Amino acid sequence: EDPPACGSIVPRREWRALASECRERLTRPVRYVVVSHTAGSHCDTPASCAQQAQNVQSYHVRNLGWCDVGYNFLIGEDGLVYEGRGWNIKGAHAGPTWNPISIGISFMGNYMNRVPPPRALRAAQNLLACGVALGALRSNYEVKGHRDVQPTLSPGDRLYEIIQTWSHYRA
Amino acid sequence: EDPPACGSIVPRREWRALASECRERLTRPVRYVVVSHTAGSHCDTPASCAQQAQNVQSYHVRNLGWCDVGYNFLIGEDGLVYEGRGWNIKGAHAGPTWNPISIGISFMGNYMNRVPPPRALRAAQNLLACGVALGALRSNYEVKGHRDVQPTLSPGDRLYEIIQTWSHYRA
Amino acid sequence: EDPPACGSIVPRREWRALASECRERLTRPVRYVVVSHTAGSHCDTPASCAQQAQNVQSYHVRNLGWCDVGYNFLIGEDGLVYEGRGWNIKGAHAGPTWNPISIGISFMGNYMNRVPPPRALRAAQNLLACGVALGALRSNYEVKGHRDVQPTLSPGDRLYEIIQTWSHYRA
Amino acid sequence: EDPPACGSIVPRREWRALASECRERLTRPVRYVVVSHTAGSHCDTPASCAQQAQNVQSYHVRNLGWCDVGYNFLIGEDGLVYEGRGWNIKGAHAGPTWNPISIGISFMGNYMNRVPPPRALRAAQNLLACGVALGALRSNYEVKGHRDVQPTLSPGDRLYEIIQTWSHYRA
Ligand SMILES: CCCCCCCCCCCCCCCCCC(=O)O
């Protein structure tokens, strides 16, 4: 409840995910959200994004031998969320301490030198309130930048700068 | 016991490192070597590299609350090697899979667009040879890029292209 | 040209096993390994363990109606691995979710209040390393207690405790 | 991912070996393997074959004044490999020509009028492949029977005929 919805996420089958092999569960309501980037190419259409989400997965599963793409959800510059490991499965995105207690969402692109467009930002915002509404995320969830829990440049200077201002951001 | 056997590393205390509190050990002889870059700025004097080593440790220890700098050794463009957690102590540089069974060496800089100078490449090779000589690494140890084991651009394209040519490189 | 190498196993006919009727194949390479005990009488002679294997197979096939012994491999305290369904055929040891995606090995005996002697531990670990060598296991494979994937005391408190220390264990 | 040793060798300490005193290093990769019998009592349980290694070692050490058991490894009718001098400590099993250029393995019992069990033979073949894998034995290695290289009836007639069928055997 409320039955109304969450909605507007591209399902795995629809971007043609390879089947996941992951079996580890997050405990809902999940306290933490970690915001990463692909550091990769971005994509501004559902056709390229679905392909991009695909490439990201191919890296993690094929090259790295992982169970599935590492993130719970991915965000496109086309303004749409891509189902990754989803609300219920532990991602592989922020280390053995943050993985079991957070949702990892990754913007598809390199935001060291670019700001992700407004619609990508809206998509992430709506995805998170989506999560609250479902009970997947605590009403007072905390948003962390990837670099805050792991040594890395992601989510990129520009993007890290933007999230730092979000309501649910925590030092 | 007679002096003839490798060495010349800038010791922790010399670069002024904070006391490590990491207790977790590796098992010699170690099979795997993971090459990373700091992804931040670079330095080309013992002056600046000692300082920079300090910065990287500060971030991992002060910001991330880690027991020590995540790397086992750092490589400066001054051509010197900076003692991180060293041969014996499990670091935090490539995930719960690679960390207990590798030695993480990080070049201080960003090699997406730039190559480390010869003296930096020699410092790192020579270090490895020294690790073999000591029985800290296997005689047939394997080198991998960060990006071969974790999803990241590290250790930067240019540097990645070089480690790939190494005698001990195995993707 | 044979398949190399790897490890030593007591064949089906050597422990006088009934012919298997199982046909459903596992998809190589397998990501998971599940460790159980049989909660059966234990054994410490080659002869006494071949006998126990027959008893366990006998229970599975005659009373449970399975196509063969449920386990892929069994372990005796005699230090020997007994071949069950083997690397290629799906076992019945861990519920319909895990059976299609795992290798189940089972230590013959009850491990609530006993330890398996070091030789059984060695065989089990070598069996696994050799599953990897063959490409029947993945290199980044993961071992799980039976109790981690089903509500059961299996593989016994003592032995569960033991297998938590393994390189490859993921809860 | 993962330690430690192939061929599931019973370590010297587990059979209660008196401490070794040998020091002559063997020059791996070793070209020859030499197969013998002990001409001693045989044994069929890991307990009786511990005792028997012990009995052989004691003869060599206490009686013959040797630094350690003559054999690099011993093979039991229990089906296990008993560590003697190992891969790098040059053995005393085949005399001044063969000791420095072969690895010597001995089956525990007399094999003039009987054969060792299939598991005993499996364990040796395993052991050998575990040797090549370690770069202890060279890939293209030759196997000789004790008699091919020394005036003795060892390894026993029945055991001799079997090893002549080994892919790697050379008269
Ligand atoms: C292929 C997976 C490697 C796992 C090695 C564990 C089992 C021991 C070896 C059996 C197959 C690979 C041989 C190399 C093992 C060397 C380990 C060591 O020296 O400590």
Curated annotation (Swiss-Prot), chains A, B, C, D:
GO biological process: defense response to Gram-positive bacterium; detection of bacterium; innate immune response; negative regulation of cytokine production; peptidoglycan catabolic process
Disulfide bonds: C6-C130, C22-C67, C43-C49
One annotated GO molecular function: peptidoglycan binding
GO cellular component, one term: extracellular region
One of the Pfam families matching this protein, by short name: Amidase_2
Compartment(s) where it occurs, according to its Swiss-Prot or TrEMBL record: Secreted; Cytoplasmic granule
InterPro entries xref list: Amidase/PGRP_sf, Amidase_domain, Peptidoglycan_recognition, PGRP, PGRP_domain_met/bac
Residue ranges of every copy of the N-acetylmuramoyl-L-alanine amidase domain listed in the record: 28-156
Domain of life: Eukaryota
Keywords: Antibiotic, Antimicrobial, Disulfide bond, Immunity, Innate immunity, Secreted, Signal
Similarity-based family: Belongs to the N-acetylmuramoyl-L-alanine amidase 2 family.
Function: Innate immunity protein that plays several important functions in antimicrobial and antitumor defense systems. Acts as a pattern receptor that binds to murein peptidoglycans (PGN) of Gram-positive bacteria and thus provides bactericidal activity. Forms an equimolar complex with heat shock protein HSPA1A and induces programmed cell death through apoptosis and necroptosis in tumor cell lines by activating the TNFR1 receptor on the target cell membrane. In addition, acts in complex with the Ca(2+)-binding protein S100A4 as a chemoattractant able to induce lymphocyte movement.
Subunit structure: Homotetramer.
Protein name (database record): Peptidoglycan recognition protein 1
Source organism per UniProt: Camelus dromedarius (Dromedary)
Gene: PGLYRP1
